[PDB]
Scaffold this active site. Structure first.
Site, mmCIF file in Angstrom:
data_model
loop_
_atom_site.group_PDB
_atom_site.id
_atom_site.type_symbol
_atom_site.label_atom_id
_atom_site.label_comp_id
_atom_site.label_asym_id
_atom_site.label_seq_id
_atom_site.Cartn_x
_atom_site.Cartn_y
_atom_site.Cartn_z
ATOM 1 N N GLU A 1 1.072 -1.026 -0.401
ATOM 2 C CA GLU A 1 -0.101 -0.309 0.109
ATOM 3 C C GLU A 1 0.959 1.568 -0.660
ATOM 4 O O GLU A 1 0.380 1.923 -0.229
ATOM 5 C CB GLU A 1 -0.701 0.042 1.052
ATOM 6 C CG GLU A 1 -2.184 -1.060 1.785
ATOM 7 C CD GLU A 1 -3.179 -1.996 0.156
ATOM 8 O OE1 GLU A 1 -3.254 -0.476 -0.476
ATOM 9 O OE2 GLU A 1 -4.045 -2.693 0.570
ATOM 10 N N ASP B 1 -5.840 -4.098 -3.422
ATOM 11 C CA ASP B 1 -6.426 -2.918 -3.902
ATOM 12 C C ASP B 1 -5.206 -1.817 -3.639
ATOM 13 O O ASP B 1 -4.693 -0.668 -4.737
ATOM 14 C CB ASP B 1 -6.743 -2.637 -2.477
ATOM 15 C CG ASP B 1 -6.328 -3.289 -1.533
ATOM 16 O OD1 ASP B 1 -5.199 -3.329 -1.318
ATOM 17 O OD2 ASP B 1 -6.298 -1.530 -0.044
#
Ligand code: CA
Length: 634
Positions: A55, A227
């Protein structure tokens, strides 16, 4: 040359960017890897502050993309991709080509069940259990001329804090923590090297904590966070838009992102390539495609010998979706991936993702957790009346429950920011009502103190009920509810929220509808006030932050499940056996400068106050400033 907006929000971005890149503040390792946070003592998704996640790498790209937009200087953005590819995308010594090349797409992996408690691990391999076919492998291999995977591993021990890299090294080490299912909290894991050569741990390294087999061989395993890779695509698109206007060539970086997006198609698939819906049955290819961004795909193989495996994940969380990334890869010329089917697949995912958000939208407007093709992670029968989405059963808290994976309001802002940017970019009418309803709920739940120029946003969410089964259109889901149980000064999330509201307002700007104009004003003013108050009240030396309380640090003494008779050692000599705790297998935490403060607070039963500067949080705030400053050149 492009005319760059001169307003205070652009300048706020530049000042934040300068703080993040100030060597005095220590956001980056010697390699140029962004740490999870400036501070070391913190336990969240990573369990040490100078670990980092994929991330953070993609937030680093995004930050640099915005800076390139505002300055015309792309050197920082290139640097971000360069360190990404060097240190978080596994290379040749990490995923030996000989193992990857011996993959069988007709036998991608061996089934093992997930269990509702860590004490039920290791999970036995079931060689007789059904596993479907991998329909991506041959295409990707033909396209890229290799069997290796180009995706980010999710967790990195940046300075070798655990010592899996040896006693005299601070080179980054790929590591994993979570392995033992839905009830294994961050406090209950056993850290392991991704490359388990059985140098540390027990007789079989760490392998037989998790997997039950008659023999064990040295092996690697990497686990993607879809993600993060999607955000890398999102960032690189923003950079490429700027590059075309500034007249700069970053085509080879565009190519990196589309390759990553190509492999990211593994996030579309059931864990063991089981048919979606009829999950007891082995799939024959795309009938195992869920077409969402699942919680992970993972891949591994032998070190001492040549074999490999791949899995997707049966679990899907709204918080991981990214329609902006899916639209980029399917509907723009520059980001069409090289695999012949990739653009079509991504177009199908885009459609499915937008439906998924709608299906999950509560009566109040917050988005509910998600859905799974595998009840209990072992393909258990769904109870009668289970509400479904293309055959997948509704799950209020996908993947993990300690704490509930949809308790945190952060997922709302992170994920809906992507919908908003997507809606602005594409003006897809299917996203409008979704955003209208979500934005109303979010703005109704920001608490401003205008005298103090401070605010609170939702911190913790409570869910009840369940959506109507998806039949093709939103129903209002009148029996699906979210309540805000607590509010807080969650500044990183507030940044993301402002970002979402800014793109949503900007997308509404062309509407002549009177109700849209009111929504525009509310969203834009809420976003602006968040930014103004962040700037006015929450600045410190290192960025923008505020004290937070961690009342769960009592769980430093949380018992860790170890099977009876199992013994092993961490690299620093910490004994791993029954009776061990989070802290006792991480004794270097007691060497942390903030440790005395922690044990002092615990000793007299106080919460622990900390001020954190998380890389994603500072990035989200910076990017929120740049976003408002570029969309509204007022
Ligand atoms: Ca290092």
């Amino acid at each position: 040359a492009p005319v760059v907006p001169n307003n205070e929000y652009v300048q706020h971005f530049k000042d934040m960017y300068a703080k993040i890149h100030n060597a005095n503040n220590g956001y980056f390792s010697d390699e140029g890897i962004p740490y999870h946070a400036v501070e070391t003592l913190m336990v969240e998704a990573p369990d040490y502050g100078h670990e980092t996640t994929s991330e953070a790498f993609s937030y680093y790209m995004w930050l640099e993309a915005m800076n390139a937009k505002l300055t015309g200087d792309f050197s920082g953005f290139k640097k971000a991709w360069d360190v990404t590819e060097k240190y978080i995308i596994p290379g040749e010594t990490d995923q030996p080509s000989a193992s990857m090349s011996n993959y069988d797409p007709n036998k991608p992996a061996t089934y093992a069940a997930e269990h509702p408690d860590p004490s039920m691990y290791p999970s036995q391999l079931q060689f007789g259990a059904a596993v479907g076919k991998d329909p991506l492998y041959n295409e990707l291999k033909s396209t890229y001329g290799t069997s290796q995977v180009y995706g980010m591993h999710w967790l990195l021990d940046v300075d070798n804090w655990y010592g899996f890299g040896g006693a005299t090294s601070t080179s980054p080490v790929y590591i994993n923590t979570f392995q033992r299912g839905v009830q294994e909290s961050c406090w209950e894991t056993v850290p392991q090297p991704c490359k388990d050569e059985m140098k540390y741990g027990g007789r079989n390294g760490f392998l037989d904590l998790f997997t039950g087999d008659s023999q064990y061989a040295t092996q690697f395993k990497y686990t993607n966070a879809p993600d993060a890779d999607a955000r890398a695509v999102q960032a690189t698109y923003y950079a490429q838009l700027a590059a075309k206007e500034w007249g700069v060539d970053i085509s080879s970086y565009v190519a990196k992102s589309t390759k990553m997006g190509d492999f990211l198609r593994y996030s579309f698939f059931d864990k063991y390539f089981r048919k979606v819906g009829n999950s007891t049955q082995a799939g024959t290819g795309y009938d195992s495609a869920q077409y969402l961004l699942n919680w992970y795909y993972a891949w591994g193989g032998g070190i001492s010998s040549n074999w490999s495996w791949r899995i997707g994940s049966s679990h899907n969380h709204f918080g991981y979706q990214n329609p902006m990334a899916a639209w980029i890869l399917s509907n723009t010329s520059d980001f069409k991936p090289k695999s012949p089917n990739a653009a079509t697949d991504w177009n199908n995912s885009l459609k499915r993702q937008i439906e998924f958000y709608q299906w999950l939208q509560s009566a109040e407007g917050g988005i509910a957790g998600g859905a799974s093709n595998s009840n209990g992670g072992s393909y258990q029968a769904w109870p009668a009346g289970t509400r479904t989405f293309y055959g997948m059963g509704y799950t209020p808290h996908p993947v993990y429950e300690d704490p509930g994976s949809n308790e945190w309001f952060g997922m709302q802002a992170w994920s809906m920011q992507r919908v908003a940017e997507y809606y602005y970019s594409s003006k897809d009418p299917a996203a409008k009502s979704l955003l209208d309803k979500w934005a109303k709920w979010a703005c109704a739940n920001v608490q401003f103190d205008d005298a103090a120029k401070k605010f609170k946003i939702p911190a913790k969410l409570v869910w009840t009920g369940q959506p109507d089964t998806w039949t093709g259109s939103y129903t209002g889901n009148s029996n699906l509810h979210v309540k805000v149980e607590a509010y807080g000064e969650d500044l990183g999330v507030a940044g993301s929220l402002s970002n979402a509201l800014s793109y949503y307002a900007k997308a509404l700007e062309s509407s002549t509808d009177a109700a849209d104009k009111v929504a525009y004003n509310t969203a834009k003013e809420t976003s602006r006030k968040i930014l103004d108050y962040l700037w006015a009240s929450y600045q410190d030396d290192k960025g923008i932050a505020v004290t937070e309380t961690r009342n769960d640090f009592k769980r430093f003494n949380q018992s860790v499940y170890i099977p009876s008779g199992w013994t092993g050692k961490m690299p620093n000599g910490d004994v791993i056996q029954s009776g061990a705790t989070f802290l006792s297998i991480r004794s270097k935490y007691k060497q942390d400068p903030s440790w005395p403060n922690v044990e002092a607070a615990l000793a007299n039963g106080t919460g622990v106050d900390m001020t954190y500067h998380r890389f994603w949080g500072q990035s989200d705030i910076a990017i929120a400033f740049g976003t408002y400053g570029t969309l509204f050149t007022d």
